[PDB]
Write an enzyme that holds these catalytic residues in place. Structure first.
Site, PDB file in Angstrom:
ATOM      1  N   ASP A  69       1.688  -1.306   2.223  1.00  0.00           N
ATOM      2  CA  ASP A  69       1.633  -0.121   1.382  1.00  0.00           C
ATOM      3  C   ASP A  69       0.347  -0.028   0.577  1.00  0.00           C
ATOM      4  O   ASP A  69       0.228   0.863  -0.268  1.00  0.00           O
ATOM      5  CB  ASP A  69       2.835  -0.084   0.439  1.00  0.00           C
ATOM      6  CG  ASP A  69       4.146  -0.078   1.181  1.00  0.00           C
ATOM      7  OD1 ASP A  69       4.114  -0.165   2.424  1.00  0.00           O
ATOM      8  OD2 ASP A  69       5.205   0.021   0.530  1.00  0.00           O
TER       9      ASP A  69
ATOM     10  N   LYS B 283      15.310  -8.477  -1.613  1.00  0.00           N
ATOM     11  CA  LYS B 283      14.173  -7.690  -1.143  1.00  0.00           C
ATOM     12  C   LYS B 283      12.855  -8.414  -1.396  1.00  0.00           C
ATOM     13  O   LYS B 283      11.955  -8.399  -0.543  1.00  0.00           O
ATOM     14  CB  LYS B 283      14.183  -6.317  -1.810  1.00  0.00           C
ATOM     15  CG  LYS B 283      13.029  -5.431  -1.406  1.00  0.00           C
ATOM     16  CD  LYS B 283      13.091  -5.052   0.058  1.00  0.00           C
ATOM     17  CE  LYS B 283      11.982  -4.076   0.400  1.00  0.00           C
ATOM     18  NZ  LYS B 283      10.647  -4.703   0.212  1.00  0.00           N
TER      19      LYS B 283
END
Ligand SMILES: Cc1ncnc2c1c(I)cn2[C@@H]1O[C@H](COP(=O)(O)OP(=O)(O)OP(=O)(O)O)[C@@H](O)[C@@H]1F
Length: 1726
Positions: free
Chosen positions: A79, A105
């Site tokens: 990202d 996560k």
RNA sequence: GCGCACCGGGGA
RNA sequence: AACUGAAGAGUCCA
RNA sequence: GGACUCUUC
């Protein structure tokens, strides 16, 4: 559904940042009409806008095209990227709310990067991983309120239509960060022409853009005109020079025209005092001073208290006959005569029943059985025998011989002769009094001790329970004259060996007629009393003498009062005894105004209407007697011959005036107080002109035109340029001065240091639900036909008033009032027409008959009376817990309850939201000397006004001068007042009349509309000002409800006046208001007006206005005439500290100074601020918030704090009462009261407890304290210091062991031999072993036997009804209070706990009830009286009782009874073990000095006492920053030691840290020990003491008492914890130095900073989230590598903490270890 | 002899 | 079937 | 964190 999706399509379209990357998602979100597709596109767009600012936060460039790793490398899918040189920064982002899921996560991302770290760093370029996980969908690309509106809709789509997933539930986690005012955009704006009209008013003729030159030229031409018209006599002066000779003469003549005598001497004054009233006649008169009777009586009281209630006439008389039998038996055998009063004897329930009628009644009853069929002599015995068996059935105990029940022939020939007990209900002259009045001297304590005994019998008279009173005394008109008591109630007291009896007839807490009765003379005196007002005099005979003696020691050195001290002492004691004997509210007020009199006397200028403010309306003879005594005392002390020691006399008279606190706060009458409060509310509005009667939710046109008209009239005040001149007493604000105040705020002339305000929408505080929850009251609206009810019914109210009048007639008027006259016929006719319940006058009675017939057709009293009310009440918590059951979010903030809840408004106007207008209700406050009207809004009103207050407090905290929400500012104000009085500078001690009743929300709206806050950006400025303008206009149109009792009383009064049933035709304004509306046919239910902000409702708003307006006034005066002023305001209170030049001008040209004071008055009044007549200008004393400051001495308010402790404090158990008195006395000692007086107050409380029959254990009060036990200790220290005096030999051994132990635990040595060995199990063996392992002589076996009786050992005391570790619960509640389910659990627990506590009898009377019942819980589910426990202890062998002089009981229990089947050995607790636990915990809290050796003082300096040698002192302490252990330390330790329980109970609720410890917490020793102990043993909490500390507030102590006190003496990490993590984290994983990475570390503050000084000090703190760059720190991010800051393969900067021996333990305790160690060592060199 | 808004309280 | 909005401090409880 | 009590506005 279908409308909401279109709304958010519009909202996203209209509001969204013009970023191309988001644009591609914006164009796809507006077309996916499929609700699932719309939801997915919306979540994607939120994710993009979250990941586009993180990339702009950490510097990484955004992969808009999803460029894979190969793509960037050529030039899995990151990202972000910042690949430059050999430094590659890969960024990825996510949004998870669950802290458990966040970990999953984060671990997945770490694996995804670490699977290619080796491959990337293998050849050329090294990898620098970066994560920016977020906990909510904040998304500041969208504007702030949209992030909540969009979130709500996005969640609702899946919650309503997508019923076919519960994973990404951050759509419930609220995404807002602001106050919530901006959420008004989520409602429809319907603001029509009315709002435009009001704003145009606010913006007309008001030129708020003047420069400083125009303001200063316009303000020195108000002064020339004002001064010329003040010298010319056209303007009325308001300030008067103080004479001190004409001001005493004015107090002497104050009541001259009420008939008070010109003057008197002491001899006549004392003669009047000792005879004024029946109590005062009795206090100083010449009193001239086992049994089977009690056995039945003490036994029959239980019998009826444990059997059926409603004891019939037959049943009670049997008890009388039995008591008579017992009395005759005692007379025959023993030969005793007690228990009688003349010919009456005390029967079961206090009943002073008479013999003659008891005999006569038995004559009839036995005669009945002659025709009812052995003989009379046997039948009566069988009556008692049947009762005796039934009485015994309920399971004797106490001895009760049955042989005294053989026959009844004794009654047939039993004759006791004597006087008769009487009550005189009418006034009797002081000639029927049978004792030589006025004999007892005042120089002793005989009179204060008779009041104590008599007062105690007045309080005990409230305990009598009402029973059937057969055998009435008198009939007809004689019932309120001398009444011959055949059956009354009595309470016996004993004065100097004489048995008196207080005889009454009515049972309860109401005002009654009492008669003191003696056996030799019959009646002694009679009076009327309200018993609840007589508590402070109980057992206080020694406190109230030491008080007077203390005050006399202050003035004992004035050589010119040397011959007048005896009279002064006499007069002071007379005043005290008078206010204690006759507790009148009108005497409370008279004693209260004396502080304003004396304040004026010592000062220089005072208001001209001061002596019209001091004057109080006196009624009774004792109130005029009190005024005479005060006049005499003041005339003595304040003579003009006496000149020296003025400070001591000011002190003395101010304390005499504070004697008003010895009279209870409670209302003498409720209805009168309530009517007077409503008169206060309504009179200013009638005088202005605006009282809009009965408004509606949809406001009519007439109401709106009226509000606009009177808003225009508010702003049209005229001053000093009009022919009539300035007109004080008129509410309003000028236009010239409004447009000067705002013109100089919008000019940077007021608040200059040139200023920089900041937007108060952003900086306003965010209020949660529990911030607004308590057990206070809140109004609950009543709905019919779906519409809120706002109007009383005329028909129902008229019927209700008629019914009440009929009741009162039946009780009073039916039996009196000349039953052949007009009023009897009228009220009889008016009373026949009321069914169900058990001239113009002709026309009115016709109407009244019609109305009542209509109602009685409709319905018969309870339903009617509950159908007239239009409101209900709940508590704040009940309403909130009902409200949170409608919202659908996680966090429970106010914005989630007003705007995003289920029952939230949908549209809004300028008069009120969709769900009705803002509505308050009125009640009254019980305070000292005065009426306060109280406004109780409903829940929605409370929430919206809370938002307003948050906004204006945010403003006020940015400007210097308000002491309302700023303790630092208050302390600076105190220091400035002290310095001012020190230099003898003038100091105006201001005060404002009618703060609430005159300032209105319209004034605040005009001022807000004309102010400019952010002059840089104007759009957001105007938008925020618009939001507040709307909220403040909702308060312009509020509806204040008229109480139910007020309208009911007014309607009864109306009907009486209509039928002619009244003496005079005088009508106050309020009665005119109500009668005009009652005549036409409408009941005034609610009232709206332009005025009345509300008492304390808009408190921060009015404080802000006071701040800015006072700043302008002081600036104007400084511009006009030299000098300067330093004003500290606190919203209705002010202190203005004048300059030195103004002080000089006061002596140079006093005419000019009076002109300047008059100009200040004028300017204040032109800005709607009315200075009170109680406002003084002076150089002697200062005053701000009841805190006086004379020059060379301290002013203690001794009587206020002595009187605080003597009242009936509403406490429920005997230990709560002791703790409360300890707290009050701590406050007293801190505020000047000596300590030898505090010991007397503590003894008074212990005597109150002993009277209640409670065992006085060593853990209640320490009545031998020093100064050092209050200044330096806390409650636990006083308990230690009492036990150390009970058993001083053993406590030495315990403290030797504790000194040796506490030193080793803090270092960290002997933890297992303490923790899991000898803080658990048998206490005595534990103590012995602890002493053995430390090489200290163990306590001797005799010392281990000391104990104390713990009556709540098994279970707390069962009090009558009127009707997981604790550490984990602590942290859980603290973290969970901000969640909807957490707030609901807390609210429910509080609701149930309060519902339980409300049913418990409170006070001294309830305490005695509770401790007389079965209040002690036995070992296994049973209840026992305290006497049962004491008897079982008495029987048991070996248990001795020991007592010190005061009455403290400690026992001696041999160490073999618990084995030897002792049921009462489980109530006792060893006393050395408790001493060890108390001493250890309070050594953790206070310090290590607690364990030193107590050494008494050997002063022997033969010094003088000097009673006014007061000295400020500070609690000496050793640990200030070293032991600031916070919640985070406990959380980290708890996670380390007990992980499973931590993650089960504390992890879900934990945010703002998100578990970013990284395993470099300091690992505190002696904190993990305490945590391990508190998880295991829940008896003692050591961790609650580590986070506790003694405050550094000052104590004003006598310097002589400080010398006699004992002496005992034994013995930054927050910032470094942040530096510790950075230096050790860098080695394992090099990280990027950004705002989000650095703040992520749990340890972080909220130019000594060094390497990171620039970013943290301002850049991080301001809020700009930017990476740290080499440009700062002395556009490439600096990756933090091992041991130094890197920019391009080189360490351009280096950081290093001071590593220590223990610090290296963490680094080596982390599970490449050698490689990290090797690189560490090289760095350490440089 | 309380309350003292004229109005209430003062023997089931 | 009555008593609010805040400020300071202290105590208790889980 | 909740409750309670004192003083203040
Ligand atoms: C909102 C609220 N809720 C309960 N109590 C409140 C307030 C407020 I704002 C003030 N108080 C208190 O009221 C007393 C002084 O009352 P105060 O002497 O001013 O009577 P007053 O008739 O106004 O006299 P002046 O108008 O001549 O100044 C004093 O305990 C304290 F100020």
């Amino acid at each position: 559904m279908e409308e909401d999706i279109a709304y958010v399509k519009d909202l996203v379209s209209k509001y969204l940042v013009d970023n191309e990357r988001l644009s591609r998602q914006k164009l796809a979100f507006l077309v996916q009409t499929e609700p699932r597709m719309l939801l997915m596109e919306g979540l994607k767009l939120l994710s993009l806008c979250i990941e586009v600012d993180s990339c702009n936060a950490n510097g990484c460039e955004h992969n808009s095209e999803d460029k894979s790793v190969e793509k960037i490398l050529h030039e899995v899918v990151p990202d972000g990227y910042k690949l430059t040189g050999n430094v590659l920064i890969l960024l990825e982002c996510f949004v998870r709310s669950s802290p458990a899921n966040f970990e999953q996560k984060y671990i997945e991302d770490l694996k995804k990067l670490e699977q290619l770290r080796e491959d990337l760093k293998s050849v050329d370029i090294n990898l620098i991983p970066l994560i920016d996980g977020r906990t909510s969908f904040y998304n500041e690309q969208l504007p702030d309120w949209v992030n909540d509106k969009l979130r709500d809709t996005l969640f609702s789509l899946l919650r309503y239509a997508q019923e076919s997933s519960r994973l990404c539930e951050s759509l419930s986690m609220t995404s807002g960060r602001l106050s919530g005012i901006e959420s008004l955009n989520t409602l429809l704006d319907n603001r029509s022409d009315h709002y435009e009209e009001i704003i145009a008013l606010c913006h007309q003729g008001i030129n708020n853009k003047l420069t400083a030159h125009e303001v200063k030229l316009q303000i020195e031409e108000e002064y020339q005109v004002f001064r010329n018209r003040l010298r010319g006599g056209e303007i009325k002066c308001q300030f008067m020079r103080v004479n001190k000779d004409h001001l005493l003469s004015e107090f002497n003549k104050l009541y001259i025209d009420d008939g008070v005598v010109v003057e008197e001497n002491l001899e006549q004054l004392t003669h009047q005092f000792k005879r004024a009233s029946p109590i005062l006649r009795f206090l100083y008169s010449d009193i001239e001073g086992e049994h089977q009777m009690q056995c039945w009586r003490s036994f029959l009281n239980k019998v009826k208290s444990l059997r059926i209630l409603n004891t019939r006439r037959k049943l009670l008389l049997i008890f009388d006959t039995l008591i008579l039998l017992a009395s005759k038996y005692d007379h025959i055998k023993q030969g005793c005569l007690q228990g009688w009063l003349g010919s009456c004897f005390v029967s079961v329930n206090d009943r002073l029943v008479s013999l003659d009628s008891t005999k006569r009644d038995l004559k009839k009853w036995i005669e009945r059985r002659q025709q009812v069929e052995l003989s009379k002599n046997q039948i009566l015995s069988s009556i008692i025998q049947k009762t005796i068996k039934r009485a015994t059935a309920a399971m004797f105990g106490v001895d009760m011989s049955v042989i005294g029940l053989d026959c009844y022939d004794s009654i047939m020939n039993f004759d006791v002769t004597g006087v008769t007990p009487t009550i005189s209900y009418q006034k009797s002259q002081e000639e029927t009094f049978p004792y030589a009045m006025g004999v007892v001297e005042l120089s002793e304590t005989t009179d204060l001790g008779r009041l104590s005994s008599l007062s105690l019998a007045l309080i005990n008279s409230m305990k009598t329970s009402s029973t059937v009173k057969l055998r009435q005394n008198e009939f007809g008109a004689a019932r309120y004259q001398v009444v011959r008591c055949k059956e009354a109630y009595c309470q016996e007291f004993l004065l100097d060996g004489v048995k008196f009896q207080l005889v009454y007839q009515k049972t309860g807490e109401c005002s009654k007629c009492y008669a003191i009765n003696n056996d030799k003379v019959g009646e002694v005196c009679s009076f009327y009393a309200d018993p609840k007002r007589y508590f402070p005099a109980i057992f206080s005979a020694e406190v109230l003498q030491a008080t007077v003696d203390t005050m006399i020691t202050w003035i004992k050195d004035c050589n010119e009062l040397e011959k007048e001290l005896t009279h002064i002492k006499l007069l002071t004691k007379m005043i005290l005894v008078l206010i204690l004997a006759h507790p009148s509210k009108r005497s409370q007020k008279l004693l209260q105004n004396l502080r304003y009199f004396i304040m004026a006397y010592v000062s220089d200028y005072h208001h001209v209407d001061l002596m019209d403010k001091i004057k109080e309306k006196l009624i009774t003879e004792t109130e005029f007697l009190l005024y005479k005594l005060i006049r005499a005392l003041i005339s003595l002390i304040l003579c003009n011959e006496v000149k020296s020691m003025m400070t001591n006399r000011f002190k003395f008279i101010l304390n005499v005036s504070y004697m008003c606190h010895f009279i209870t706060k409670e209302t003498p009458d409720r209805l009168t107080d309530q009517i007077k409060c409503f008169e206060k509310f309504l009179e200013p509005k009638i005088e202005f002109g605006h009282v809009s009667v009965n408004p509606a939710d949809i406001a009519t046109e007439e109401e709106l035109m009226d509000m606009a008209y009177h808003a225009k009239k508010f702003l049209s005040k005229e001053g000093c340029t009009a022919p009539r001149g300035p007109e004080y007493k008129k509410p309003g604000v000028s236009k010239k001065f409004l447009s000067l105040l705002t013109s100089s705020f919008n000019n940077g002339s007021l608040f200059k240091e040139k200023k920089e305000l900041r937007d108060p929408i952003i900086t306003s505080g965010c209020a949660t639900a529990l911030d607004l929850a308590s057990n206070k009251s809140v109004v609950v609206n009543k709905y019919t036909d779906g519409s809120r009810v706002l109007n009383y019914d005329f028909n129902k109210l008229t019927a209700l008033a008629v019914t009440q009048l009929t009741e009162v007639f039946s009780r009073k008027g039916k039996h009196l009032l000349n039953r052949q006259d007009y009023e009897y016929k009228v009220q009889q006719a008016m009373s026949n027409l009321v069914l169900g319940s058990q001239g113009s006058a002709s026309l009115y009675f016709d109407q009244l008959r019609e109305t009542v017939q209509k109602i009685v057709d409709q319905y018969d009293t309870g339903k009617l009376s509950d159908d007239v009310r239009i409101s209900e009440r709940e508590s704040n918590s009940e309403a909130l817990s009902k409200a949170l059951s409608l919202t659908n979010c996680t966090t429970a903030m106010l914005k989630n309850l007003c705007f995003y809840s289920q029952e939230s408004p949908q549209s809004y106007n300028s008069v009120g939201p969709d769900t009705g207008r803002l509505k308050f209700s009125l009640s009254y406050k019980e305070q000292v000397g005065g009426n306060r009207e109280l406004y109780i809004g409903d829940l929605r009103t409370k929430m919206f006004t809370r938002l307003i207050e948050d906004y204006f407090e945010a403003l006020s905290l940015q400007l210097s001068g308000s002491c309302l929400n700023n303790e630092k500012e208050f302390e600076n104000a105190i220091l400035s007042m002290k310095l001012n009085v020190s230099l003898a500078h003038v100091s105006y001690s201001m005060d404002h009349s009618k703060w609430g009743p005159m300032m209105c929300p319209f004034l605040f709206l005009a001022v807000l509309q004309n102010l400019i806050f952010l002059s840089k950006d104007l759009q957001a400025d105007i938008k925020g000002r618009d939001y507040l303008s709307t909220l403040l206009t909702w308060h312009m149109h509020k509806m204040v409800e008229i109480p139910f009792n007020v309208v009911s009383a007014m309607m009864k009064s109306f009907i009486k006046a209509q039928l002619g049933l009244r003496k005079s035709t005088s009508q106050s304004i309020t009665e005119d208001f109500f009668y005009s509306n009652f005549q036409v046919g409408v009941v005034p239910s609610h009232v709206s007006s332009i005025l009345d902000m509300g008492q304390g409702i808009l408190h921060n708003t009015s404080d802000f206005y006071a701040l800015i307006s006072e700043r302008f006034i002081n600036y104007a005066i400084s511009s006009v005439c030299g000098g300067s002023i330093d004003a500290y305001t606190s919203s209705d209170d002010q202190i203005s500290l004048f300059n030195q030049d103004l002080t000089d001008l006061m002596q140079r040209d006093p005419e000019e100074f009076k002109t300047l004071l008059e100009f200040h008055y004028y300017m204040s009044n032109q800005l709607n601020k009315f200075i009170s007549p109680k406002s003084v200008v002076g150089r002697f004393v200062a005053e701000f918030k009841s805190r006086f400051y004379v020059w060379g001495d301290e002013v203690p308010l001794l009587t206020k704090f002595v009187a605080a402790a003597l009242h009936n404090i509403k406490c429920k158990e005997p230990h709560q009462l002791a703790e409360t008195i300890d707290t009050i006395i701590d406050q007293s000692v801190a505020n000047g009261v000596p300590v030898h007086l505090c010991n007397l107050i503590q003894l008074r409380t212990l005597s109150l407890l002993q009277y209640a029959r409670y065992p006085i254990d060593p853990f209640l009060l320490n009545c031998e304290t020093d100064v050092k036990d209050w200044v330096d200790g806390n409650r636990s220290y006083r308990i230690m210091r009492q036990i150390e005096s009970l058993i001083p030999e053993a406590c030495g051994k315990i403290r030797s062991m504790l000194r040796k132990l506490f030193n080793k635990l803090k270092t960290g040595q002997l933890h297992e031999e303490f923790t899991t060995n000898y803080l658990s199990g048998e206490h005595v063996s534990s103590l012995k072993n602890l002493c053995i392992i430390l090489d200290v002589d163990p306590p001797s076996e005799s010392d281990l036997e000391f104990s104390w009786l713990n009556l709540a050992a098994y279970h707390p005391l069962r009090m009558v009804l009127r009707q997981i570790p604790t550490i984990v619960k602590t942290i859980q509640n603290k973290l969970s209070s901000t969640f909807t389910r957490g707030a609901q659990k807390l609210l429910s627990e509080a609701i149930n706990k309060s519902a339980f506590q409300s049913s418990i009898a409170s006070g001294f009377v309830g305490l005695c009830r509770t401790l007389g019942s079965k209040c002690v819980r036995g070992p296994n589910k049973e209840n026992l009286y305290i006497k049962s426990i004491q008897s079982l202890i008495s029987n048991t062998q070996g248990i001795e009782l020991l007592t010190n002089n005061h009455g403290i009981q400690y026992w001696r229990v041999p160490l073999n009874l618990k084995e030897e089947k002792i049921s009462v050995a489980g109530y006792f607790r060893p006393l050395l073990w408790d001493y060890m636990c108390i001493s250890l915990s309070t050594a953790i809290e206070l310090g290590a000095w607690v364990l030193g050796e107590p050494k008494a003082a050997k002063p022997l300096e033969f010094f003088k006492h000097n009673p006014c040698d007061y000295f400020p002192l500070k609690p000496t302490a050793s640990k200030l920053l070293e032991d600031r252990v916070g919640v985070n330390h406990i959380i980290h330790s708890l996670r380390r030691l007990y992980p499973s329980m931590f993650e089960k109970h504390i992890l879900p609720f934990m945010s703002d840290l998100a578990s970013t410890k990284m395993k470099w917490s300091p690992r505190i020793k002696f904190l993990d020990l305490c945590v391990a102990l508190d998880v295991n043993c829940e008896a003692l909490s050591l961790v609650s003491h580590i986070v506790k500390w003694k405050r550094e507030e000052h104590y004003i102590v006598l310097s002589s008492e400080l010398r006699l006190s004992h002496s005992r003496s034994h013995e930054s990490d927050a910032v470094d914890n942040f530096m510790r993590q950075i230096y050790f984290e860098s080695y394992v994983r090099s990280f990027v130095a950004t705002t989000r990475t650095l703040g992520s570390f749990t340890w972080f503050p909220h130019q000594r900073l060094g390497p990171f000084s620039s970013f943290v000090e301002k850049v991080i703190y301001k809020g700009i989230e930017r990476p740290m760059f080499k440009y700062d720190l002395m556009a490439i991010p600096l990756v933090v590598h091992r041991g130094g800051l890197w920019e391009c393969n080189k360490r351009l900067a280096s950081f290093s903490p001071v590593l220590q021996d223990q610090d290296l333990e963490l680094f080596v305790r982390e599970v490449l270890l050698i490689g990290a160690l090797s690189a560490m060592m090289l760095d350490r060199l440089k």
